[PDB]
Amino acid sequence: SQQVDKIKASYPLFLDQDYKDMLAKKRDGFEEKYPQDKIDEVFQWTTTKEYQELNFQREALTVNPAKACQPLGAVLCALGFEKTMPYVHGSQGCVAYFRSYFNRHFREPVSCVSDSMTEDAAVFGGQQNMKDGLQNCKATYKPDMIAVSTTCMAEVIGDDLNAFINNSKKEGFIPDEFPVPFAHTPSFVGSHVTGWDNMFEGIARYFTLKSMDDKVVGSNKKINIVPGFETYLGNFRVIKRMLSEMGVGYSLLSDPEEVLDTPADGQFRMYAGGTTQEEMKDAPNALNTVLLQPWHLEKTKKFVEGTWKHEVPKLNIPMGLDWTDEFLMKVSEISGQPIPASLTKERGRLVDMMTDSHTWLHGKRFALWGDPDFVMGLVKFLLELGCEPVHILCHNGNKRWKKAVDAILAASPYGKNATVYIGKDLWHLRSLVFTDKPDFMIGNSYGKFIQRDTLHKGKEFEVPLIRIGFPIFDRHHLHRSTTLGYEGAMQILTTLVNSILERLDEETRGMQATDYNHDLVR
Amino acid sequence: SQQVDKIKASYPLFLDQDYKDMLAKKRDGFEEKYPQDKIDEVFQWTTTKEYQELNFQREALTVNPAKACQPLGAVLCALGFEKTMPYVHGSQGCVAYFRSYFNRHFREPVSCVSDSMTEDAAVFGGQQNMKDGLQNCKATYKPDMIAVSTTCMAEVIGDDLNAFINNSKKEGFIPDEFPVPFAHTPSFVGSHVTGWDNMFEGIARYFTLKSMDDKVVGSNKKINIVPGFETYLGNFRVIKRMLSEMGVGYSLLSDPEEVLDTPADGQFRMYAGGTTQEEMKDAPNALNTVLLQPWHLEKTKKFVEGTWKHEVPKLNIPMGLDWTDEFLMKVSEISGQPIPASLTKERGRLVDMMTDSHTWLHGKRFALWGDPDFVMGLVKFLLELGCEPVHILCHNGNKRWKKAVDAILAASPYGKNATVYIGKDLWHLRSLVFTDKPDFMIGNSYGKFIQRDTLHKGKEFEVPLIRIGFPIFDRHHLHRSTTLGYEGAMQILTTLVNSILERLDEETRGMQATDYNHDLVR
Amino acid sequence: MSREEVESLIQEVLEVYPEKARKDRNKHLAVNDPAVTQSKKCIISNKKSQPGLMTIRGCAYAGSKGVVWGPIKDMIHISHGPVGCGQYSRAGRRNYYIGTTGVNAFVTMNFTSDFQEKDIVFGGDKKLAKLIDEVETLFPLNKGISVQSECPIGLIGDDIESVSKVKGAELSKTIVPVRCEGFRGVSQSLGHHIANDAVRDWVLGKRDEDTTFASTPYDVAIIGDYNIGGDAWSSRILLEEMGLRCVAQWSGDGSISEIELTPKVKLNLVHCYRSMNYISRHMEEKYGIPWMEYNFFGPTKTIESLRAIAAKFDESIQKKCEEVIAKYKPEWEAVVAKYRPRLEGKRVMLYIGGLRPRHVIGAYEDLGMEVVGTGYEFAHNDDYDRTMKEMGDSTLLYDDVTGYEFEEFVKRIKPDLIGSGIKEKFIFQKMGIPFREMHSWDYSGPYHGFDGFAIFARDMDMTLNNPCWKKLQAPWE
Ligand code: ICS
Ligand code: CLF
Ligand SMILES: [Fe+3]
Ligand SMILES: [Fe+3]
């Protein structure tokens, strides 16, 4: 029954008495459900420490992972160049998943193509599929470059991308001067950040391998910047603004911010902005190359230091206060341009916010997860704020990164209770926050279920989630926020302090019970 | 009893058994408290329609007002000029309260002085107080200008500032050429915005009334901008950015964003930025003058039209889409400069964000309050989003403003249920949200006590609050945000849609009760 | 130590002032001598502020409505006059209470006459009567009404006393008019006296012919504790655990009944001398109730005050006091052991007007911190008589210090911490000195008693030792 003046969606229509009775009838008649007491007892057992031991003894089962496969990052990297069509050599089903993932996160149209390989191509290879796909894509969508990636199936079969592309070139399917870089991105190696690294190295090698004769370091007086797997537009914006504000000639390779924030003015632009091909060609002429995310740009660093002959600096991700300062000082030293008064004014304002909010920020316990560099810089910033990161989780981390984070933690008195987990999934984190409760969680939308679990144990056991990372699905337009630099530090600080104060306001809203602490001024 | 490892603040230390027993003993023994049944009955009575009628039959008593007194706005206006000391002729408690209010809102130092008038000045007037205060302030704090407003004490006893200041100048207390603009700001007339208008008119008349012989309109080819009572730093920043992006020469008058956002670098800057006296002298050479908040800038409009001979455009506050477009087009017409592609891209991005989030915003009921111009712009923007304002409140609104808002509501199918109230306070709004429940409230922190009240009636009767306005005390660094232009519209849209989504997420967190709608993707 | 260069520092700071301002301000800055019992020969207080020097003092309305009358929960306090005075003082003070707001408790509320020009010109008393009628109509569960007058009420000429009498007789309910106009008095100090006089004249003598209260020989009354962050409850639990029964609290979490029942009490426990010594002296003269001052800041002062209070009763109360001291010894001993090493030997400057700076000095010294300078904006000469013994030799004393004077003193001395109000918090946070909001306990607390000492130590450690203070200077500067 629905009222025409007040129409109810699934919630709370299915809370009606008739729907409740029908659900109860179904459950008691045909579902053969376990008794409610048994369910409650099993749930209680899942929150105990013995369950945590059994869950940490897992060796083959992965539950609720916090990472994706390489071609997703490869497609994101391919999206950062001008009029470049991301091409995935493999079956068509996974390209749809990539597009759906990026559509749900960015809330923008994402363009990608696949050659739709089938078991007939599985038994004989995908050479003809590659030829037809290249020809059809070039004829239909008119790109100036096609970046080729591999689905895990083409990797298991063992298709040679170079041979297939060359054969397509010499048989008239595509013009011989058409740039078609390729990269091998096995989905069973690393994660999406590794795919981004593979695709970027493939494009750089395609554009700057055979032309390394008329190349002099520092000719154009520009600095190359590689952003890595970045899902915040504000990060690209802040890097560009910080570099242009102090008069430093820069060259942002693979920036997708223009194509992922196109305006809605009655027309559809499939391509917009990006890195030009001449920009990639002129890359080795730069004085130096700066990697914003070194810990997943290892192969790119190897190629840059081995072919471009660029002395890549030992720089962390520009997140926090000390690391942003170090990045600015290194760029100033490389380019010879002094840091202007505006940047130091911004730094002073950020220190002002830290000083104003240290009282509420001090001592709070956070359990955070995400990509390695983002996680490590977030831990550094939390240690700068006097915060306590107790559970640090990185599914796609390695022992080297874990040792680096341990060295970072040991240099601060607030890292005494900090433990770093690599290779562990979100079920491990659920057990961790159940057996050692922090004050808040910091991660993507996939943590929103863990919060629910805690709320079932009790209100006093709930661990609220703070949505900072990738992917954020349940909130709108959070991809436009900033994460790197002073501006990103201000945004993160504001989010943390306001989440803490909102939690306090919720906890102290009980009239005649806890409203004695319902302060107007906080 | 305290554990040295887990020290408890007031909450939840006062939730222990011993403290609860102590409070119960106190209440039962020596308080003569009413029975809880009587308290519950009266609370339920307060949420009825008859109690609303009794509440709206009020003529003498006002409970929880939504406005302040004029000298607060006078001090805010005075703070926006270069090396200008706000001076309040009257009692010192006024200045103490103004400084505390602004410190609690902006979390920044606020400088203001008083002559500390007392019973002696109440009997014999405050001429000597003014002389000594001017001399002491100039000698100690060394300002380039002193901006004088009045306290209700000085207004009732008829202390005229003109004769006092002239006597101080001619008796040697201050140099004759020292600029001391003055204004009369009675606290029983209007509100803080009226004080801002009065003080700005006083300063403009001081600097321009006697030099109208060599001033020709359009000589300096700039456009004057008068912001009005503004407590958002982003609102000044966005206007500066939009005007500089168009290549339009402008002159911001009374901009305090620099002194209100000083950096923390080991030094205390008591003066920072602000409009210089030269720009106030050259103000009537501008092509035109634009008033950002015309509903509380009427007297300065009369002064500008009558004396400066400027044809002030009939423009609304640049809030939303249509009004920002009108402001940009009018500025382009006045200055002759075309609107660039960056602003078109920003408007397209705003429209894209509107279309992406239109599903969750349609049909939502809002009860909002604030200042006349801000409230009108907010109602307009809510109408452009498909939202439904229901209770519109303005404690400092007049009949003309209410008629204008009614005309605005009549031109949209979403304003039928909307009703405008002028002269009402927050108790009236509590009655309105109890008897005609909206979905959300939009206002300053004083609305939080309303939310608690609703939560006392029930979880399904609670009306959450969204903090947009002045003053915001319970949250940190929200004064850094924007409300004008496309940037401000983007921020407001993000806040509204994410508040709605967070409320929906909260309502569907119970496992096996309502979690079937706890969707990962929204 | 080092009195000579602090003397010369006072001389240098006083150089910018005009001759008259310099001459007056010279009397309010002093060098502490602990061997002095009469501060009148060293410092001068309770004088008017020099015009235009950015004083921190408030008005008598703040000291009456916002301090004494405000914490009373079941009464309705009408800010008679323009809106702003009650608007800026609404919920700004963390006087904690238990009650249903808007039904039987009205502390965070703002009732005001909201005077307009027609009220300034044509009377205003009939508006007050109509306001009282509306208040009785909409808020039936209130147990009294106070009318705190603002500046224009006395200036225009109004008789709120006749309205109070007439409406109290008509509605059979107590109405207390308080002439707490801002211009009366040089600071909040006179507001305390006016509010105490109002309580004495309109509330205190209500239950004089009543003898239905069953009084016990252990009855006490907490006077001068306004429950900031729950301070009064932390003192109350210690007093009750000692075997005493408290029937009144003045006025934090207080009620009209506690005020009326206070004259039936055997001992008056006065925490804040400055704000309630008047009513304590009146109740000693009239009802013969003795009164004493106690201190619950830190463990040492808490133990001293507990023993002193127990000394006024029989031996059982003393044994109970020994029991509670033994019970609470390990708690504060552990707090000291944990937090003193991080805070040992660090210098602090204080500037809180009224009783708090002398009281807090014992709690600071308990954690190995030393107070190098102190002062009160509104304290009288008896307060300075009381605090000179507490403070160390050749330390700085100021009274109604201006913004410039305080900033110069802080820059020259360079203390490790400053405890003061909101008006100077951000000023000193810009210069890189850790700051604590003594008036509000930086939205933390309570600080009274053993339960409050742990929170005090944790707060001071979290603020003084925060890493943010080491990043003030840019690495490239
Ligand atoms: S009443 Fe006084 S200024 Fe004794 S007006 Fe003031 S809650 Fe201070 S140092 Mo705010 S004489 Fe109380 C005080 Fe002390 S408001 Fe509180 S902190 S102990
Ligand atoms: S010293 Fe005290 S607080 Fe000051 S006015 Fe006087 S009673 Fe009041 Fe309120 S209304 Fe505004 S701030 Fe004043 S100027 Fe008229
Ligand atoms: Fe979109
Ligand atoms: Fe600040």
PDB file of N, CA and C in Angstrom, chain B residues 235-259:
ATOM      1  N   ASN B 235      34.557  33.523   0.407  1.00  0.00           N
ATOM      2  CA  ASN B 235      33.687  34.414  -0.352  1.00  0.00           C
ATOM      3  C   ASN B 235      34.457  35.614  -0.895  1.00  0.00           C
ATOM      4  N   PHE B 236      35.402  36.148  -0.118  1.00  0.00           N
ATOM      5  CA  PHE B 236      36.294  37.172  -0.654  1.00  0.00           C
ATOM      6  C   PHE B 236      37.231  36.586  -1.702  1.00  0.00           C
ATOM      7  N   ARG B 237      37.785  35.403  -1.423  1.00  0.00           N
ATOM      8  CA  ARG B 237      38.759  34.814  -2.337  1.00  0.00           C
ATOM      9  C   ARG B 237      38.140  34.505  -3.696  1.00  0.00           C
ATOM     10  N   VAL B 238      36.915  33.975  -3.713  1.00  0.00           N
ATOM     11  CA  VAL B 238      36.282  33.605  -4.972  1.00  0.00           C
ATOM     12  C   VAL B 238      35.927  34.841  -5.788  1.00  0.00           C
ATOM     13  N   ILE B 239      35.507  35.927  -5.136  1.00  0.00           N
ATOM     14  CA  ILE B 239      35.223  37.154  -5.871  1.00  0.00           C
ATOM     15  C   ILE B 239      36.501  37.716  -6.474  1.00  0.00           C
ATOM     16  N   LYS B 240      37.588  37.737  -5.695  1.00  0.00           N
ATOM     17  CA  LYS B 240      38.862  38.193  -6.244  1.00  0.00           C
ATOM     18  C   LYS B 240      39.293  37.334  -7.427  1.00  0.00           C
ATOM     19  N   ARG B 241      39.179  36.009  -7.294  1.00  0.00           N
ATOM     20  CA  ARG B 241      39.607  35.107  -8.358  1.00  0.00           C
ATOM     21  C   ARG B 241      38.763  35.281  -9.614  1.00  0.00           C
ATOM     22  N   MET B 242      37.441  35.384  -9.461  1.00  0.00           N
ATOM     23  CA  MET B 242      36.572  35.527 -10.622  1.00  0.00           C
ATOM     24  C   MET B 242      36.778  36.871 -11.309  1.00  0.00           C
ATOM     25  N   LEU B 243      37.021  37.932 -10.537  1.00  0.00           N
ATOM     26  CA  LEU B 243      37.218  39.239 -11.153  1.00  0.00           C
ATOM     27  C   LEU B 243      38.579  39.336 -11.830  1.00  0.00           C
ATOM     28  N   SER B 244      39.617  38.753 -11.225  1.00  0.00           N
ATOM     29  CA  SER B 244      40.932  38.742 -11.849  1.00  0.00           C
ATOM     30  C   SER B 244      41.002  37.806 -13.048  1.00  0.00           C
ATOM     31  N   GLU B 245      40.178  36.758 -13.075  1.00  0.00           N
ATOM     32  CA  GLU B 245      40.160  35.852 -14.217  1.00  0.00           C
ATOM     33  C   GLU B 245      39.600  36.530 -15.459  1.00  0.00           C
ATOM     34  N   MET B 246      38.622  37.419 -15.287  1.00  0.00           N
ATOM     35  CA  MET B 246      38.046  38.157 -16.401  1.00  0.00           C
ATOM     36  C   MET B 246      38.935  39.294 -16.880  1.00  0.00           C
ATOM     37  N   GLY B 247      40.044  39.563 -16.194  1.00  0.00           N
ATOM     38  CA  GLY B 247      40.867  40.704 -16.538  1.00  0.00           C
ATOM     39  C   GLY B 247      40.255  42.034 -16.182  1.00  0.00           C
ATOM     40  N   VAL B 248      39.364  42.062 -15.198  1.00  0.00           N
ATOM     41  CA  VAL B 248      38.645  43.273 -14.824  1.00  0.00           C
ATOM     42  C   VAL B 248      39.375  43.953 -13.676  1.00  0.00           C
ATOM     43  N   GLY B 249      39.769  45.205 -13.886  1.00  0.00           N
ATOM     44  CA  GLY B 249      40.297  45.998 -12.792  1.00  0.00           C
ATOM     45  C   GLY B 249      39.225  46.263 -11.750  1.00  0.00           C
ATOM     46  N   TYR B 250      39.557  45.976 -10.494  1.00  0.00           N
ATOM     47  CA  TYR B 250      38.590  46.096  -9.416  1.00  0.00           C
ATOM     48  C   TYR B 250      39.272  46.671  -8.187  1.00  0.00           C
ATOM     49  N   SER B 251      38.454  47.043  -7.204  1.00  0.00           N
ATOM     50  CA  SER B 251      38.928  47.576  -5.930  1.00  0.00           C
ATOM     51  C   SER B 251      38.005  47.061  -4.831  1.00  0.00           C
ATOM     52  N   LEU B 252      38.446  46.028  -4.117  1.00  0.00           N
ATOM     53  CA  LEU B 252      37.672  45.528  -2.990  1.00  0.00           C
ATOM     54  C   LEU B 252      37.751  46.499  -1.822  1.00  0.00           C
ATOM     55  N   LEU B 253      36.586  46.905  -1.325  1.00  0.00           N
ATOM     56  CA  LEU B 253      36.487  47.830  -0.208  1.00  0.00           C
ATOM     57  C   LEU B 253      36.056  47.074   1.041  1.00  0.00           C
ATOM     58  N   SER B 254      36.828  47.240   2.115  1.00  0.00           N
ATOM     59  CA  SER B 254      36.597  46.565   3.391  1.00  0.00           C
ATOM     60  C   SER B 254      36.657  45.043   3.239  1.00  0.00           C
ATOM     61  N   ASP B 255      37.843  44.553   2.880  1.00  0.00           N
ATOM     62  CA  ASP B 255      38.096  43.119   2.841  1.00  0.00           C
ATOM     63  C   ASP B 255      39.003  42.707   3.994  1.00  0.00           C
ATOM     64  N   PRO B 256      38.475  42.014   5.003  1.00  0.00           N
ATOM     65  CA  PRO B 256      39.290  41.611   6.162  1.00  0.00           C
ATOM     66  C   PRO B 256      39.908  40.219   6.068  1.00  0.00           C
ATOM     67  N   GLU B 257      39.892  39.585   4.894  1.00  0.00           N
ATOM     68  CA  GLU B 257      40.335  38.197   4.798  1.00  0.00           C
ATOM     69  C   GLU B 257      41.816  38.054   5.126  1.00  0.00           C
ATOM     70  N   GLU B 258      42.605  39.106   4.899  1.00  0.00           N
ATOM     71  CA  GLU B 258      44.035  39.020   5.174  1.00  0.00           C
ATOM     72  C   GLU B 258      44.322  39.039   6.670  1.00  0.00           C
ATOM     73  N   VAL B 259      43.680  39.949   7.408  1.00  0.00           N
ATOM     74  CA  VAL B 259      43.934  40.049   8.842  1.00  0.00           C
ATOM     75  C   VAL B 259      43.279  38.889   9.581  1.00  0.00           C
TER      76      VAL B 259
END
